[PDB]
Coordinates of C-alpha atoms and ligand atoms in Angstrom, one line a residue:
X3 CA 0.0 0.0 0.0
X4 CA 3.1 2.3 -1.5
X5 CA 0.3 5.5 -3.1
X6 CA 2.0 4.4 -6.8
X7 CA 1.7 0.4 -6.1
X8 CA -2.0 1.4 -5.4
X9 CA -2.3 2.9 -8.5
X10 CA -1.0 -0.4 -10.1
X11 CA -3.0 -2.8 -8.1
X12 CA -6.3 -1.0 -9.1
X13 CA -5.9 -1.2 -12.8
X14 CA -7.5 -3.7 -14.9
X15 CA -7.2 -3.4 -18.4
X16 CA -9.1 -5.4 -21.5
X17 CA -10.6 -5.6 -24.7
X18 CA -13.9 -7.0 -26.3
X19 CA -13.4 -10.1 -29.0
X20 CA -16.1 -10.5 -30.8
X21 CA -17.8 -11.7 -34.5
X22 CA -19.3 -8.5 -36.2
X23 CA -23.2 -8.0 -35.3
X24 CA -22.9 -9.5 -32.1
X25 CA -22.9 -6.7 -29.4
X26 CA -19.6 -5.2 -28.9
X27 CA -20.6 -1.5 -29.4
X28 CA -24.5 -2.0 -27.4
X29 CA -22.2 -3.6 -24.4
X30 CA -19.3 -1.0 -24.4
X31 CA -21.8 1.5 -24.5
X32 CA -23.6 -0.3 -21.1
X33 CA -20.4 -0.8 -19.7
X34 CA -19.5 3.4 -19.7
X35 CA -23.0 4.1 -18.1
X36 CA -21.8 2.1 -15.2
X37 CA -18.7 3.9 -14.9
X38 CA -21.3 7.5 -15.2
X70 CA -10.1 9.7 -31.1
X71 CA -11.3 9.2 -27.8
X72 CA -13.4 5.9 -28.7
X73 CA -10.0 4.4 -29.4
X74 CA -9.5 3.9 -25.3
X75 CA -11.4 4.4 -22.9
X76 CA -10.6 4.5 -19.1
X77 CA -13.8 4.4 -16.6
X78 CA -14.5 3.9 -12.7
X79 CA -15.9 0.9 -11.7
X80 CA -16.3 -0.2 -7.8
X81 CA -12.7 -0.2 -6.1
X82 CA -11.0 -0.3 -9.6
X83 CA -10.0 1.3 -12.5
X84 CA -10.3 -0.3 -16.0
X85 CA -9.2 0.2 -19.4
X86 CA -11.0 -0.8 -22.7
X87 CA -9.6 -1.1 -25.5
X88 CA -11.6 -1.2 -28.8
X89 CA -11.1 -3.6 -31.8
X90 CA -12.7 -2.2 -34.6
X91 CA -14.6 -4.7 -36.6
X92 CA -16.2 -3.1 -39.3
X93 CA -15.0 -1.6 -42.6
X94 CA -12.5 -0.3 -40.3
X95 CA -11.1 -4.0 -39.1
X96 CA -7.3 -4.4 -40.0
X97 CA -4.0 -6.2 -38.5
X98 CA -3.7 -3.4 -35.7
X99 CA -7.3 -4.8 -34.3
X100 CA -5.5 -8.2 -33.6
X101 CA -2.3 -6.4 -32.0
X102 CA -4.3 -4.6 -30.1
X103 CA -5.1 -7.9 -27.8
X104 CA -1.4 -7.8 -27.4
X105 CA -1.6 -4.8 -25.2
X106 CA -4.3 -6.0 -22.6
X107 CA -4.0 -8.5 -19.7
X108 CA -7.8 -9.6 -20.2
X109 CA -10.6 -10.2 -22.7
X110 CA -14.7 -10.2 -23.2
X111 CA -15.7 -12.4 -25.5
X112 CA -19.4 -11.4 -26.7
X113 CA -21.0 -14.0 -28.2
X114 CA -24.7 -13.8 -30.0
X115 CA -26.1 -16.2 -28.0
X116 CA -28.7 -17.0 -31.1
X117 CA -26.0 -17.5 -33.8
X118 CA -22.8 -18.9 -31.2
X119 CA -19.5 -19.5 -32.2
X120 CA -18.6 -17.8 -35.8
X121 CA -15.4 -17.3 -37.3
X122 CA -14.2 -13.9 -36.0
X123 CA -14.4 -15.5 -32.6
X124 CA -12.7 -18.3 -33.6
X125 CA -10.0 -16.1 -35.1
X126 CA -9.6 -13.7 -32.2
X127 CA -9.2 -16.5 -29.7
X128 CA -6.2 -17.8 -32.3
X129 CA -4.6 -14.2 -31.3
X130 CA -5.3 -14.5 -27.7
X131 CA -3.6 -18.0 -27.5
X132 CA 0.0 -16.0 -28.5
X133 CA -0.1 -15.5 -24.6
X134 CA -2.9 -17.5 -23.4
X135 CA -4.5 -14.1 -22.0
X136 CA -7.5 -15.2 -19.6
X137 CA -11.0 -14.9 -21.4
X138 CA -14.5 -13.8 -19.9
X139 CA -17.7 -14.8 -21.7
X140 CA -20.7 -13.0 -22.1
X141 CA -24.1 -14.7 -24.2
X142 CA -25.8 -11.9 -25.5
X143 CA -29.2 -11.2 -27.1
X144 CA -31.1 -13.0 -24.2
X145 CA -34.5 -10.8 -25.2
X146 CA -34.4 -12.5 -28.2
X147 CA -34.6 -16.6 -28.8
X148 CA -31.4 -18.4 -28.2
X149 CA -29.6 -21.7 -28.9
X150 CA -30.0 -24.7 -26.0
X151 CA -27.6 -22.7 -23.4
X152 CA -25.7 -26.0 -22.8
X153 CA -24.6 -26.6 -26.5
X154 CA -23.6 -22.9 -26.5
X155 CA -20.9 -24.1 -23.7
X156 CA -20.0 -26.9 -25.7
X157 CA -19.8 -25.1 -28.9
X158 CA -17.1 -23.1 -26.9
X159 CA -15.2 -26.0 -26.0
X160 CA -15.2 -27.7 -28.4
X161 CA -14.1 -25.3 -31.2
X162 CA -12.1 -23.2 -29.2
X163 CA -10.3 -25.3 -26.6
X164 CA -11.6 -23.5 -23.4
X165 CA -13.2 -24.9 -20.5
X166 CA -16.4 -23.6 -19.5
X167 CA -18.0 -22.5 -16.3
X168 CA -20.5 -20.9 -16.0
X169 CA -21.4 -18.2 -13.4
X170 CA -24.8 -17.7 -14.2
X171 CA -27.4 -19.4 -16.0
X172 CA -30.9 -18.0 -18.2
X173 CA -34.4 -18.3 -17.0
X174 CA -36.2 -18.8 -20.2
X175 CA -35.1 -16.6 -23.0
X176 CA -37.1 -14.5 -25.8
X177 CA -40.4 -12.9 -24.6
X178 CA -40.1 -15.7 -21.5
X179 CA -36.6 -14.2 -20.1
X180 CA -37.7 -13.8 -17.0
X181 CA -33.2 -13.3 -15.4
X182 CA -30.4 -14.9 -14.7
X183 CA -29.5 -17.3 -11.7
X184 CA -25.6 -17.1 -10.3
X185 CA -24.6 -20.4 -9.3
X186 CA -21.9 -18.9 -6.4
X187 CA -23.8 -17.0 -4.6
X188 CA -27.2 -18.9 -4.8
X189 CA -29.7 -16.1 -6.0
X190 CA -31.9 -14.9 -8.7
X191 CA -31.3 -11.5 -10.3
X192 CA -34.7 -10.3 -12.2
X193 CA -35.0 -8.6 -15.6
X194 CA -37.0 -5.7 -15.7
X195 CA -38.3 -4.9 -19.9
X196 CA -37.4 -2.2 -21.5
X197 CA -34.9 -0.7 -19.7
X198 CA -31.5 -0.5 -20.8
X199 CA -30.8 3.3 -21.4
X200 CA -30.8 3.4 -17.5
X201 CA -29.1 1.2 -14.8
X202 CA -32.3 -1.1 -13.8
X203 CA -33.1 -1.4 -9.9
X204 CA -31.3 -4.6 -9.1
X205 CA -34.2 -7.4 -8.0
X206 CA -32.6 -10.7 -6.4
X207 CA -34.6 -14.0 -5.2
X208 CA -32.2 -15.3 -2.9
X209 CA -32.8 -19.3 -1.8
X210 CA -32.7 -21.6 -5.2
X211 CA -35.2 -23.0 -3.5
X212 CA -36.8 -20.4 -2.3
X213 CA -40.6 -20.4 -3.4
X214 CA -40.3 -16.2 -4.0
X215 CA -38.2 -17.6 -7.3
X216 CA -41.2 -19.6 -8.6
X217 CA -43.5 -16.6 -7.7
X218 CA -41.6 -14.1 -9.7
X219 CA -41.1 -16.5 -12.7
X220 CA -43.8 -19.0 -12.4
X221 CA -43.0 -23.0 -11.3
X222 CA -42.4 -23.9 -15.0
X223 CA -39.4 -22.1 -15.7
X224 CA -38.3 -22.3 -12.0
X225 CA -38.2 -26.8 -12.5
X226 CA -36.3 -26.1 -15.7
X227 CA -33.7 -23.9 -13.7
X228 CA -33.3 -26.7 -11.5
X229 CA -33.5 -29.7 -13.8
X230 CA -31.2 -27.6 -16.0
X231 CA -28.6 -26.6 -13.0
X232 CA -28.6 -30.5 -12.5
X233 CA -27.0 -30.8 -15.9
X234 CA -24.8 -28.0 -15.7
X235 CA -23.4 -30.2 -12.4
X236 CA -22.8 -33.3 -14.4
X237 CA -21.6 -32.0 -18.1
X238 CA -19.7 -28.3 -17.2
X239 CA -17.0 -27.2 -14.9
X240 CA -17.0 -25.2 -11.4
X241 CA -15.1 -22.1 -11.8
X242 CA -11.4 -22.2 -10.9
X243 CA -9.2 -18.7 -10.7
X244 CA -6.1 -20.0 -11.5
X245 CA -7.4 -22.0 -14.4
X246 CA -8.9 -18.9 -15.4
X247 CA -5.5 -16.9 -14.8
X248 CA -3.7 -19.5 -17.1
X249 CA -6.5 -19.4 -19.9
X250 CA -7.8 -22.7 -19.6
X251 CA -11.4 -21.5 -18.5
X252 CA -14.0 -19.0 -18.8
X253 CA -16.4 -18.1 -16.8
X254 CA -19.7 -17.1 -18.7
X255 CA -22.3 -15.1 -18.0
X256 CA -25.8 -14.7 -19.7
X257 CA -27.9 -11.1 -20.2
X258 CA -28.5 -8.6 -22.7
X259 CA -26.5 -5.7 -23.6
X260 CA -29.8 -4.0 -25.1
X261 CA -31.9 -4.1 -21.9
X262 CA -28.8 -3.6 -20.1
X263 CA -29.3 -6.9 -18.1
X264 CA -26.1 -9.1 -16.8
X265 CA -23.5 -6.8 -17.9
X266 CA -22.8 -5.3 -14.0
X267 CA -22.5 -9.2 -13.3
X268 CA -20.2 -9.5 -15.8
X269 CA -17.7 -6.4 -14.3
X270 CA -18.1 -7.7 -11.5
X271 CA -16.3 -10.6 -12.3
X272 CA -13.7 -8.9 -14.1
X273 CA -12.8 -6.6 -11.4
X274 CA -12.8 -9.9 -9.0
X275 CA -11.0 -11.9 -11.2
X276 CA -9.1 -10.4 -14.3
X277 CA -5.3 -9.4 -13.4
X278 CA -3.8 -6.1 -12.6
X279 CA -1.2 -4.8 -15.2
X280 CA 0.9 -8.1 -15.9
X281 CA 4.7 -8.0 -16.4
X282 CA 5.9 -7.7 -20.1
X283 CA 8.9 -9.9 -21.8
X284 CA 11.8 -8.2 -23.2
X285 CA 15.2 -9.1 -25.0
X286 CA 16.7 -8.5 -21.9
X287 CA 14.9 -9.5 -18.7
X288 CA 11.2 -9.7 -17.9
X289 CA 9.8 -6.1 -16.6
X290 CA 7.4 -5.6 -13.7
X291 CA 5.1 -3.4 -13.2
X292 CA 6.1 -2.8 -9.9
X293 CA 8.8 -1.1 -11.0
X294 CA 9.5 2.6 -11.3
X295 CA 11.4 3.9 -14.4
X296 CA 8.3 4.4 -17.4
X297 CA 9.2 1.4 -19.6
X298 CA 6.1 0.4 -22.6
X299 CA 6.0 -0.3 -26.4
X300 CA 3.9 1.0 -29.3
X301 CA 1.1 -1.8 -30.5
X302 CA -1.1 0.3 -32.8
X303 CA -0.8 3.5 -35.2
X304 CA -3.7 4.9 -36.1
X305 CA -4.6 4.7 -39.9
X306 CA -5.5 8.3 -41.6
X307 CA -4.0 11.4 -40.7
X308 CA -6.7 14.2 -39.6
X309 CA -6.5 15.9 -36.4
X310 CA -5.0 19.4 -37.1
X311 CA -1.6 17.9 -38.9
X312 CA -0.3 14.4 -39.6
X313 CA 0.0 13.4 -35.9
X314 CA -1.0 9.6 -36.9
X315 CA -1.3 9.0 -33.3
X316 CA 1.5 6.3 -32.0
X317 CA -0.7 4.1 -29.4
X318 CA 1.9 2.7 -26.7
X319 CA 0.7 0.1 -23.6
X320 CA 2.4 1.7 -20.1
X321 CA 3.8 -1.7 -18.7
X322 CA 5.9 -0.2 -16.2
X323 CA 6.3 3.1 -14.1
X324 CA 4.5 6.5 -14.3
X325 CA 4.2 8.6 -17.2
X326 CA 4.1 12.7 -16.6
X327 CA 3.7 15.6 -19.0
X328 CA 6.8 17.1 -19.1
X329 CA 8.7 14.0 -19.3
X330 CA 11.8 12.6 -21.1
X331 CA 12.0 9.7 -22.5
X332 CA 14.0 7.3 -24.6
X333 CA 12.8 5.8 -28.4
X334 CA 15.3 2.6 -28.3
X335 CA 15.3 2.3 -32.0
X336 CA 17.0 5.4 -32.8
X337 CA 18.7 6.0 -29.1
X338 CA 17.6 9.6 -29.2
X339 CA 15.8 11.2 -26.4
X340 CA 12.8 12.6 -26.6
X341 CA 10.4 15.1 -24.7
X342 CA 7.0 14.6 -24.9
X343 CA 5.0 17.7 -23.8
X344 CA 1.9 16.7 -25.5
X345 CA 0.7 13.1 -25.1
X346 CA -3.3 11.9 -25.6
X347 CA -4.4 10.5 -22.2
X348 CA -7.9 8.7 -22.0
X349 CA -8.7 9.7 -18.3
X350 CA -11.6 8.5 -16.3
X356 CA -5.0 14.8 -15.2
X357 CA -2.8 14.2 -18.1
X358 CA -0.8 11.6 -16.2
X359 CA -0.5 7.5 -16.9
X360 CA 0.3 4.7 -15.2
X361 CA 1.0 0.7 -15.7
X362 CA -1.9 -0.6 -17.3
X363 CA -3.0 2.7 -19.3
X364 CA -2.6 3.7 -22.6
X365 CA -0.3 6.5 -23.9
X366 CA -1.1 8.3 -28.0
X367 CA 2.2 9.5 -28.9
X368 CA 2.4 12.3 -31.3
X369 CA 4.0 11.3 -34.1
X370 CA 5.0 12.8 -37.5
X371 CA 7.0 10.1 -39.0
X372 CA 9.4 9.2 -35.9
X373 CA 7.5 6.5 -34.2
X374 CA 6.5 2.8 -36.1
X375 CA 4.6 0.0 -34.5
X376 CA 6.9 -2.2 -31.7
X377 CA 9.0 0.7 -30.8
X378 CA 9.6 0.5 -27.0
X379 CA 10.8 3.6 -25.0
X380 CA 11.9 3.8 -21.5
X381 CA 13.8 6.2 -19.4
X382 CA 17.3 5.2 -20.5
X383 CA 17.5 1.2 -20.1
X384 CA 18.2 0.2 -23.9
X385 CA 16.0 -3.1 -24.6
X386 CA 13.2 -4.2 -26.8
X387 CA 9.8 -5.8 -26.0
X388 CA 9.0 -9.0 -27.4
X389 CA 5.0 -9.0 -27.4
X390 CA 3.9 -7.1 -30.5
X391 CA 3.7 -9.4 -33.5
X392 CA 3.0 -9.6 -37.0
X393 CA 0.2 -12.1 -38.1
X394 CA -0.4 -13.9 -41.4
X395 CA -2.2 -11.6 -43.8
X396 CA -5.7 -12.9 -44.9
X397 CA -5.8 -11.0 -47.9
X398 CA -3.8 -10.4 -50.7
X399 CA -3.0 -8.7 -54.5
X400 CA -0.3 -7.3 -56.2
X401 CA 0.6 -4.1 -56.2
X402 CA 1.8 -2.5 -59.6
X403 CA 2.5 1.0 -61.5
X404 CA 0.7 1.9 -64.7
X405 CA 4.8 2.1 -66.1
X406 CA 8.0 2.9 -65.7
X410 CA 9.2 2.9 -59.4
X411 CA 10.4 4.2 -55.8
X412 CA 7.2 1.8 -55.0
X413 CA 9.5 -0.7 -53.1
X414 CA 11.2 1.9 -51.1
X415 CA 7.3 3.4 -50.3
X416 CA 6.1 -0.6 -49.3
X417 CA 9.2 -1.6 -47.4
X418 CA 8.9 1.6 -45.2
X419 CA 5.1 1.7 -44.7
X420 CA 5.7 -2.3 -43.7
X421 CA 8.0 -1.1 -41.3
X422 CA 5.7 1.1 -39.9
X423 CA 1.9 -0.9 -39.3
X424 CA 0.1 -0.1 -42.7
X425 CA 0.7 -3.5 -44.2
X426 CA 3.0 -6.2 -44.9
X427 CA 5.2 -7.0 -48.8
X428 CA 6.3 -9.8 -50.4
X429 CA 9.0 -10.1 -52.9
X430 CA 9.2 -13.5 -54.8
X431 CA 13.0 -14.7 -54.9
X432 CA 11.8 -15.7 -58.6
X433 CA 10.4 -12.6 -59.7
X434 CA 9.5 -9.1 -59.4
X435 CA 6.3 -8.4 -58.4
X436 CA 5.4 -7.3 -54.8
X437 CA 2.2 -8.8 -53.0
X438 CA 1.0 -6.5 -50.4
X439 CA -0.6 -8.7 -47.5
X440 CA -3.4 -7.1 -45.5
X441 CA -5.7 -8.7 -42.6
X442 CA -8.7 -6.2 -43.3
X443 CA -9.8 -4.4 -46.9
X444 CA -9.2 -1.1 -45.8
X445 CA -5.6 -1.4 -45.7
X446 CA -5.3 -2.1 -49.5
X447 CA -7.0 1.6 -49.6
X448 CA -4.8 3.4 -47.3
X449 CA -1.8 2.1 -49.0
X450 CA -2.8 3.5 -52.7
X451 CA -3.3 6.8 -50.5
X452 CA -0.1 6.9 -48.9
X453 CA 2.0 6.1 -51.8
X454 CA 0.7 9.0 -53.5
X455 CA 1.2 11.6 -50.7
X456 CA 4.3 10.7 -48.9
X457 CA 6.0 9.3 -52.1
X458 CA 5.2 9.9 -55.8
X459 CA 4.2 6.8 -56.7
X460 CA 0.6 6.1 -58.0
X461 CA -0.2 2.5 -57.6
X462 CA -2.5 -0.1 -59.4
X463 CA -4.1 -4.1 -57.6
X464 CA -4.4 -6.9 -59.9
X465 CA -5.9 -10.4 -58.2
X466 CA -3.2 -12.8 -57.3
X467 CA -3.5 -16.7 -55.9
X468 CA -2.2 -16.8 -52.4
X469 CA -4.3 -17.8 -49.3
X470 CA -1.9 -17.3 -46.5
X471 CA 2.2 -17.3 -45.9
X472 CA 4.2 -18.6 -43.1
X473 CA 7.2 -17.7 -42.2
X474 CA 9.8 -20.3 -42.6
X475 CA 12.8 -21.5 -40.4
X476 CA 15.1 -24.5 -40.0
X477 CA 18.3 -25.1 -37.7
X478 CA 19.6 -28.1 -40.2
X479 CA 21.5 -25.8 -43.0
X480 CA 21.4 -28.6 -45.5
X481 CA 17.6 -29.8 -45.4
X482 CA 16.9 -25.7 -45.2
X483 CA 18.8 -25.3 -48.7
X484 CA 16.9 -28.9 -50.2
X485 CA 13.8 -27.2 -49.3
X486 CA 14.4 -23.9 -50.8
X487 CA 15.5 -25.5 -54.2
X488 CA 12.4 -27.6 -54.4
X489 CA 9.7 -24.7 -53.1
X490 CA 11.5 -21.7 -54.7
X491 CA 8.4 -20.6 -56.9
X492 CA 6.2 -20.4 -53.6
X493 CA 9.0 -18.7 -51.5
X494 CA 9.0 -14.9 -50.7
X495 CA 11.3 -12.2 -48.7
X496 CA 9.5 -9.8 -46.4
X497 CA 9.8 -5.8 -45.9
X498 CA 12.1 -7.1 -43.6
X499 CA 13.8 -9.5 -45.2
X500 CA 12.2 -12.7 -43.3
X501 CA 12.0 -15.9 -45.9
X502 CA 8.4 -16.8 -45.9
X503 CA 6.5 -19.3 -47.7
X504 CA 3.8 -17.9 -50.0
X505 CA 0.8 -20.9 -50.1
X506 CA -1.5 -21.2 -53.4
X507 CA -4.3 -22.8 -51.0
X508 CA -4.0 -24.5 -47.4
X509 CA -3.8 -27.5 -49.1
X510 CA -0.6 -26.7 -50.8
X511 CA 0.4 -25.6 -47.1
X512 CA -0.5 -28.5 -45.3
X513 CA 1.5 -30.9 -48.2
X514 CA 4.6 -28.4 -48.0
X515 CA 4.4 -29.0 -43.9
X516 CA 4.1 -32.5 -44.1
X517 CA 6.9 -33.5 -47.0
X518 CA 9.3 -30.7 -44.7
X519 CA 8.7 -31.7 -41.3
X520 CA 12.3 -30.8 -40.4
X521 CA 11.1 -27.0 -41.8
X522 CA 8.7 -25.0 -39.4
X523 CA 5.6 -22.9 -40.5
X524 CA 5.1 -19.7 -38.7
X525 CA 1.7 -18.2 -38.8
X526 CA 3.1 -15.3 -36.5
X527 CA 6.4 -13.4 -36.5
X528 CA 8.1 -10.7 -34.2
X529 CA 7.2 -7.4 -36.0
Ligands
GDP601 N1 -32.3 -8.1 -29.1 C1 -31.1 -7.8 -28.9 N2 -30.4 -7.1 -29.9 C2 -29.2 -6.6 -29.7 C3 -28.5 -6.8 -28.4 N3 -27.3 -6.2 -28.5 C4 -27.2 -5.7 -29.7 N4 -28.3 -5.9 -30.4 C5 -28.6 -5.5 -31.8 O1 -27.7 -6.3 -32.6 C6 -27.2 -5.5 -33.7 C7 -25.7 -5.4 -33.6 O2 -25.3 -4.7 -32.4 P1 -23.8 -4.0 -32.3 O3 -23.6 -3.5 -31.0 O4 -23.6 -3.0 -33.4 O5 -22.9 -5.3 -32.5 P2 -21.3 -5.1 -32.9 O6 -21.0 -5.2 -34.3 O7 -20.4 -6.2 -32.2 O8 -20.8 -3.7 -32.4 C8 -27.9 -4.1 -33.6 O9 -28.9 -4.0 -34.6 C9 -28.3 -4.0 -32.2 O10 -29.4 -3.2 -32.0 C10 -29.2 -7.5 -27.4 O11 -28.9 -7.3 -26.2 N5 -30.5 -8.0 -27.7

């Protein structure tokens, strides 16, 4: 109880995963009314704590920085429609999450509406994405019939109120299970389903467990609706309970603390577009250690200058950060995503990754051709990632979400001269390649060469025509390995 130490243990600090449509806007928006650009972060009260969300854009906005965004939190909501279940953004967010097995809280959404059988939306969980279950608490009917939700740990009834949800409903709890109140304010039916339902809860899911949880091996999972603002208080509260205060970060070095003093973070995200009133192209950087102040000096490690930074974006609940928050650096060409800064000590964080692009075409001028330089240094930056064939020419620019593809036709007109033209290529994914045996390495190179591909940075990578043509190039190579993920 050290007045900075209190300002670590507080924190809490997380981002929504979820499939597009499914409620991440409705709940974030619930979420601030219980805590009474800006929507990039954003930094509330809730009980003894303070907790930061960061947002994922989804939409048309949806690109690589979305998934490196998970990097930078100790904890994630997963919001599930609770009608539709698993679908493959979830699925695909969870992949990211497993990079460092960050613990997961589950929320079923859309409970005013009719949902899928509540115990094969557990197992659709765990059996597609490899996570225990436990739930916390568990629907009384659903639809027109949702009547609340029961919490199996503290043996009581919390009652939905209709049409609520631009407010904070009074809170209504039924406390016995078996307490005939419950089958007054819900009626006998749906009071014997509870129980006969809670029975196979018992036999077929698992009791919540905290370090389990802490390790990412379960989840617990709540049940409400974001729209009538109904189970998302019970969900915070389990976050605040449960979720971790700002967790220690890995370096090339040593493994950093957030106990420590000395500000000490690394840039995860840079925000595509330039608007405000210049270029800024705000720099988004996770505090993991020590206490950010305005007139501060710090070091960028990748150019070993020091800087001042007299102007910094803070998303308060003043102008001041700590472990856990997050920092927008102004930046007019000096800062690129993964660039750590401390107050001196020269090392590099090891977190912030670059992921195999979903999406690709290749990128080409209406002549003669700077357009390399332009990719290589907008790859070293966040906007995207290139590919240069050892057989050929061409470049392949690999994006994660359309927009990029637009942003880069942009940039290369602006900040260099070039004006820049797609055509459709075959690719489904790459992996970046790497084998200790020199002599296997060099056999497989010779007989893959057409399918082989250097990076902005210079990392061999195999280009795949399909996953099947991956999956035979992994098996006839075994001594090779496939990375999906590199260090950026
Ligand atoms: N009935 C019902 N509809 C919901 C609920 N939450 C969100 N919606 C609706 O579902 C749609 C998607 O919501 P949205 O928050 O934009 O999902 P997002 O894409 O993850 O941000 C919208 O038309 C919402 O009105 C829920 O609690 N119950």
């Amino acid at each position: 109880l050290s007045p900075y130490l209190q300002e670590v243990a507080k924190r809490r600090t997380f981002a929504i995963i979820s499939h597009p449509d499914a409620g991440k806007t409705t709940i974030t928006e619930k979420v601030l009314l219980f805590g009474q650009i800006t929507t990039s972060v954003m930094q509330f009260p809730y009980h003894d704590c303070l907790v930061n969300l960061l947002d994922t854009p989804g939409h048309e906005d949806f690109s690589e920085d979305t998934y490196r965004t998970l990097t930078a939190v100790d904890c994630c909501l997963m919001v599930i429609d609770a009608a539709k279940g698993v679908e493959d953004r979830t699925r695909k967010l969870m992949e990211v999450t497993r990079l460092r097995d960050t613990p997961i809280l589950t929320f079923m959404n859309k409970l005013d509406r009719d949902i899928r059988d509540p115990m094969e939306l557990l197992d659709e969980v765990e059996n597609e994405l490899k996570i225990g279950c436990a739930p916390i608490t568990w629907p009384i009917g659903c639809g027109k019939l949702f009547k609340g939700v029961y919490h199996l740990y503290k043996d009581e009834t919390y009652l939905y109120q209709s049409g609520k949800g631009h407010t904070i409903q009074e809170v209504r709890i039924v406390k016995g299970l078996n307490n005939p109140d419950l089958d007054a304010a819900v009626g006998e039916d749906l009071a014997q389903q509870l129980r006969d339902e809670l029975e196979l809860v018992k036999g077929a899911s698992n009791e919540f467990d905290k370090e389990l949880f802490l390790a990412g091996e379960i989840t617990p999972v709540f049940f409400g609706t974001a729209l009538g603002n109904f189970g998302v208080d019970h969900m915070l509260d389990g976050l605040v309970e449960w979720a971790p205060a700002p967790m220690p970060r890995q370096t090339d070095t040593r493994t950093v603390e957030a106990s420590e003093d000395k500000f000490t973070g690394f840039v995860f995200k840079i925000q595509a577009n330039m608007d405000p009133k210049h270029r800024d192209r705000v720099a988004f950087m996770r505090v993991v250690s020590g206490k950010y102040e305005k007139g501060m000096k710090l070091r960028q490690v990748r150019t070993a200058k020091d800087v001042v930074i007299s102007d910094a974006l803070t998303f308060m609940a003043v102008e001041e950060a700590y472990p856990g928050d997050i920092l927008g650096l102004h930046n007019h060409g000096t800062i690129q995503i993964g660039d750590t800064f401390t107050q001196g000590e020269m090392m590099k964080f090891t977190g912030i990754p670059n992921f195999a692009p979903e999406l690709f075409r290749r990128i080409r001028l209406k002549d003669p051709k700077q357009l390399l330089k332009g990719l290589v240094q907008l790859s070293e930056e966040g906007a995207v990632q290139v590919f240069r064939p050892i057989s050929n020419n061409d470049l392949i620019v690999g994006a994660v979400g359309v927009l990029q593809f637009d942003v880069v036709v942009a940039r290369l007109k602006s900040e260099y001269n070039v004006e820049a033209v797609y055509e459709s290529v075959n690719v489904a994914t790459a992996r970046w390649v790497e084998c200790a045996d020199a002599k296997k390495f060099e056999e497989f190179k010779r007989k893959n060469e057409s399918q082989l591909a250097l990076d902005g940075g210079d990392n061999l990578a195999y280009i795949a025509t399909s996953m099947v043509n991956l999956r035979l190039a992994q098996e006839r190579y075994p001594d090779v390995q496939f990375h999906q993920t590199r260090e950026h």
